[PDB]
Amino acid sequence: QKKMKSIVEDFLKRLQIFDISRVPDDQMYRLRDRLRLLPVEIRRLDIFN
Amino acid sequence: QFDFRASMHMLTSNLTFTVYSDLLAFVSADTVEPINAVAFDNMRIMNEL
């Protein structure tokens, strides 16, 4: 039930050079799809394990 | 001519009943949360979440 738009929106906000008001939701979900294919960082992955 | 034998009948009916019109008013119809709504293929209607 979790809509992941908030995660990508926070990501773009923290990159500090994009204006998220100008970014549609489809682009954010495409970013989500690309992020979903990346392996997790070792420390974060082990903490989650 | 009026004949009592030929005019006396027994009319038969039911003692009482209640006639209803809106059958669907007897159905309590609820719906799942839209986030969890699925299509004919048993997958969610919208999967991008």
CA–CA separation, A44 and B14 (whole Å):
78
C-alpha distance from residue A33 to each of A4, A22, B17, B22 (Å): 10, 19, 63, 49
CA–CA separation, A4 and A31 (whole Å):
10
| Rounded to 5°, angle at Cα B37 from B31 and B41 | 125
Of the partner residues B35, B36, B49, the one whose CB lies closest to the CB of residue A4: B49
Q: What is the resolution of this structure in A?
A: 2.7
CA–CA separation, B49 and B45 (whole Å):
10
Provide residues of B within 8 Å CB-CB of chain A: 33, 35-36, 48-49
Q: How far is the alpha carbon of B35 from chain A, nearest alpha carbon, in Å? A: 6
Method by which the coordinates were obtained = cryo-EM
Q: How many beta carbons lie within 10 A of that of residue A8, not counting itself?
A: 21
B38 vs A contacts (CB less than 8 Å)? none
